[PDB]
Scaffold this motif. Structure first.
Motif, PDB file in Angstrom:
ATOM      1  N   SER A 273      34.973  49.439  42.111  1.00 32.16           N
ATOM      2  CA  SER A 273      34.637  49.476  40.888  1.00 32.16           C
ATOM      3  C   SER A 273      32.984  48.606  41.065  1.00 32.16           C
ATOM      4  O   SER A 273      32.602  48.126  42.149  1.00 32.16           O
TER       5      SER A 273
ATOM      6  N   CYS B 160      40.285  49.511  43.347  1.00 35.35           N
ATOM      7  CA  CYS B 160      39.779  48.723  42.245  1.00 35.35           C
ATOM      8  C   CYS B 160      38.750  47.656  42.716  1.00 35.35           C
ATOM      9  O   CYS B 160      37.675  47.406  41.954  1.00 35.35           O
TER      10      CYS B 160
ATOM     11  N   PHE C 219      38.646  45.962  33.126  1.00 34.89           N
ATOM     12  CA  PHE C 219      39.862  45.138  33.095  1.00 34.89           C
ATOM     13  C   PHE C 219      38.951  43.771  33.570  1.00 34.89           C
ATOM     14  O   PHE C 219      38.379  43.583  34.518  1.00 34.89           O
TER      15      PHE C 219
ATOM     16  N   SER D 166      43.475  46.892  30.137  1.00 37.30           N
ATOM     17  CA  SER D 166      41.953  47.533  30.368  1.00 37.30           C
ATOM     18  C   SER D 166      41.354  47.580  28.714  1.00 37.30           C
ATOM     19  O   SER D 166      42.269  48.088  27.981  1.00 37.30           O
TER      20      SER D 166
ATOM     21  N   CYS E  78      47.304  39.746  35.169  1.00 33.48           N
ATOM     22  CA  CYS E  78      46.754  40.872  36.032  1.00 33.48           C
ATOM     23  C   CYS E  78      47.830  41.739  36.834  1.00 33.48           C
ATOM     24  O   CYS E  78      47.588  42.844  37.291  1.00 33.48           O
TER      25      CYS E  78
ATOM     26  N   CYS F 174      46.364  47.730  34.754  1.00 36.84           N
ATOM     27  CA  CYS F 174      44.997  48.514  34.677  1.00 36.84           C
ATOM     28  C   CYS F 174      45.000  49.547  33.502  1.00 36.84           C
ATOM     29  O   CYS F 174      44.055  49.463  32.541  1.00 36.84           O
TER      30      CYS F 174
ATOM     31  N   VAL G   9      44.722  55.770  37.751  1.00 40.10           N
ATOM     32  CA  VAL G   9      44.464  54.390  37.952  1.00 40.10           C
ATOM     33  C   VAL G   9      44.053  54.007  39.303  1.00 40.10           C
ATOM     34  O   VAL G   9      44.919  54.475  40.174  1.00 40.10           O
TER      35      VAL G   9
END
Lengths: 107, 108
Positions: B60, B56, A77, A60, B3, A56, B50
């Motif tokens: 988001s 997330c 991201f 990103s 990821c 992240c 973060v």
């Protein structure tokens, strides 16, 4: 910090991260995901696509915007799932259901 | 999965997440942060901003786009640090150094 919250068993998503929306922050999850929270079995699958804390930060596009109230640090991201990935169909289908899904339930 | 990668001890950032860029993915880090990776104490500080994996997904704005090669699933997450947060000045300073910072190192 808000950015560090997690959803325990027996919270709805909106009890932690706000009403589900369309086209804005908080837009992921249909009414069944909202209700079941982390027990929705689609949530485990989707979390496989979410960046780790290092990905992240370093993977990103990051955009700091200073405003009178403070620093709005944006992370963008993008996770890529190849067309022939064994899980591709399932992820696309969960996105179909949940992104901007508020007001609907699957099946 | 790309990821889910993490940066081990003794590895540079670009070994794991590609070269530092400007105005694109991979734009976070100046040349010292690239070289030092997780040894750089600025990294420790910045991870506090973060999102968790839950934040997330559910905090988001999420945008799926399909392309011939597959699904490009975009997460846009914005962490807000109040101007009067006692760590505000430090975070802002790290961003000034490291965002699109490739090609520079900080003063010492």
């Amino acid at each position: 910090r808000y950015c560090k919250r997690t959803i325990p068993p027996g919270y709805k998503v909106d009890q932690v991260f706000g009403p589900r929306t369309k086209g804005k922050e908080g837009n992921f999850g249909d009414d069944k995901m909202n209700e079941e929270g982390i027990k929705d079995g689609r949530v485990t699958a989707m979390l496989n696509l979410v960046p780790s804390s290092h990905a992240c930060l370093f993977g990103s596009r990051v955009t700091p915007k200073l405003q009178p109230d403070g620093l709005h640090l944006k992370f963008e991201f993008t996770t890529v799932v190849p067309r022939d990935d064994p899980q591709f169909d399932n992820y696309v289908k969960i996105c179909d259901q949940c992104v901007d899904g508020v007001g609907t339930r699957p099946k």
